Amino acid sequence: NPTYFFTFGDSYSQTGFSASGTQPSASNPMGNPDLGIGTTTNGPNWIGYLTTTENASLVLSYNLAAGGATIDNALVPAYPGDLASQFRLFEDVYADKPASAPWSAEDAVFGVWIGINDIGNAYYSTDAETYTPKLISRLESLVEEVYKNGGRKFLFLNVPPTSRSPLFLEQGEEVVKQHAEYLSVYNENLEGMVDDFTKKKGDVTTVLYDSWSFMTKILDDPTAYGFPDATCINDDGTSCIWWNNYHPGMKYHLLQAEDMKPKLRKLGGW
Numbered sequence: 001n002p003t004y005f006f007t008f009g010d011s012y013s014q015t016g017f018s019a020s021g022t023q024p025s026a027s028n029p030m031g032n033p034d035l036g037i038g039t040t041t042n043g044p045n046w047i048g049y050l051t052t053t054e055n056a057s058l059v060l061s062y063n064l065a066a067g068g069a070t071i072d073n074a075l076v077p078a079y080p081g082d083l084a085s086q087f088r089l090f091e092d093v094y095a096d097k098p099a100s101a102p103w104s105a106e107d108a109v110f111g112v113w114i115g116i117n118d119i120g121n122a123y124y125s126t127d128a129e130t131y132t133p134k135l136i137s138r139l140e141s142l143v144e145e146v147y148k149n150g151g152r153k154f155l156f157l158n159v160p161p162t163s164r165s166p167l168f169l170e171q172g173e174e175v176v177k178q179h180a181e182y183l184s185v186y187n188e189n190l191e192g193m194v195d196d197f198t199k200k201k202g203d204v205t206t207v208l209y210d211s212w213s214f215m216t217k218i219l220d221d222p223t224a225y226g227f228p229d230a231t232c233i234n235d236d237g238t239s240c241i242w243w244n245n246y247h248p249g250m251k252y253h254l255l256q257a258e259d260m261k262p263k264l265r266k267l268g269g270w
Contacts, residue, residue, distance in 0.1 A: 002026070002058040003269035004103040006094065006146075007047055008086045009113035011040050011247060012160075013065035015047065019093045023100050024060035031061065036250075040067075042237025043250035047111075049257035050270070059269040062101065064089055068117060072138045076118040083114050087142045095149040109267045110146050111155035113211075114139065115190070116162050119183050124175075128185035136189045140197060153205045153267050156194050158187040160215040166233055166245040187212055207263055214259050218252065225255060 007013055016038025017031060024031035029051050039045040044052070051061040066081030073082045094101045118135050143154065162168060163180035191208055198206045218241060219230040232240040237249030264270035 001107060002060050003055075003267075004101055004108045005047075005051060005059050005061050005111060005269065006090060006108065007061065007063045007065055007111040007113070008083055008090075009065035009111075009157075010069040010117055011065075011067040012116060013045060013047055013063065013113050014067050015039055015045065015061075015063045015065070017061075017063040019062075019064075019089060024062060026058055026060075029055075029058070029060050030063075039250075040247035041243050041250040041253050042235055044253065045250070046253045046257045046260070049254050050260065050264070053254070054257050054261040054264075054270060056265075056270050057268075060101075062094060065113070069114065070118045070121065071114055071135050071142075075135055075138060076122045078117055078121060083112070083139070083142060087145055091145065091149075095146070097150075105150050105152040107268060108151055109153045109155055109269065110143075110151050111157070112139070112143070113157040115159040115183075115186055119159060119179065119186055120162065123179045123182035128182040132182075132186045132189045135186070136193045139190075140193050143197065147201065147204070152203060154194075154197075155207045155209065155264065155267060156190065157209045157211045158190055159183050160211040161219060162246065164219055164230065165247075166231060166242055169231065170245075183212075205266055207267060209260055209263060211256060214256060215248070215252070218255065226251070 016033050021032030035048050036043045047063055051059045064086040068079035070076045070078045070082050072084040097103055163176045168176055194206055194208045218225045222230045227241050233242040234240040235243055237243050238251040241248055241252050243249035261270050
């Protein structure tokens with residue numbers, strides 16, 4: 001019996017999935033495009049690995065993540081396909097449980113990885129303590145739409161240390177520090193929201209995955225993971241942590257998915 005894994009996020013999660021493309025099936029769990037296409041990793045990303053390599057049973061991936069996305073263009077704007085628009089695509093196509101995706105509370109998992117671009121664009125112009133609650137409140141209201149549709153199993157990934165990507169390192173240590181301090185406040189408020197939502201609903205199963213600590217461990221000791229250093233870039237996706245100056249490669253994504261597997265057992269597909 002399948003797990004319907006609906007995901008929402010940005011370039012760390014995009015795969016190029018179209019709602020008018022081939023839809024997920026047991027013979028083709030990613031639907032479209034082929035596994036390993038459309039990512040920022042040179043191969044599968046964490047969603048492709050969770051769906052096809054770390055899965056304990058059948059997982060069907062409906063991946064709505066879009067490059068450059070922020071939470072809501074009424075807050076920090078960037079690209080048309082913000083997280084709000086991804087929830088709107090879900091509402092239009094899958095929320096009503098069509099025969100192509102006949103999900104239920106017991107077998108649907110909703111995964112969200114967002115915040116990299118909100119922080120990347122607003123860390124120097126806004127006050128973290130008072131602005132990040134507005135971003136997190138909007139994320140919560142989007143999650144509530146899916147809850148109202150009947151969703152009950154949720155996966156949230158906190159924001160990883162993009163402060164230490166080559167793109168940010170090149171901007172100088174003070175900028176790395178300002179970005180990192182802002183990001184820490186965002187991640188604390190995300191954790192608080194997930195805990196409050198879990199307690200208040202009482203009938204949900206949630207996982208908050210601390211990607212920040214995992215990636216930080218690798219950046220702090222890269223050779224223990226088979227990477228020569230924490231800063232090199234290689235678009236093969238495996239020689240270095242970084243596939244380009246702002247995105248990690250497929251080797252990192254596989255290590256993350258392997259780290260996530262045990263923490264996702266309670267969600268049903270792992």
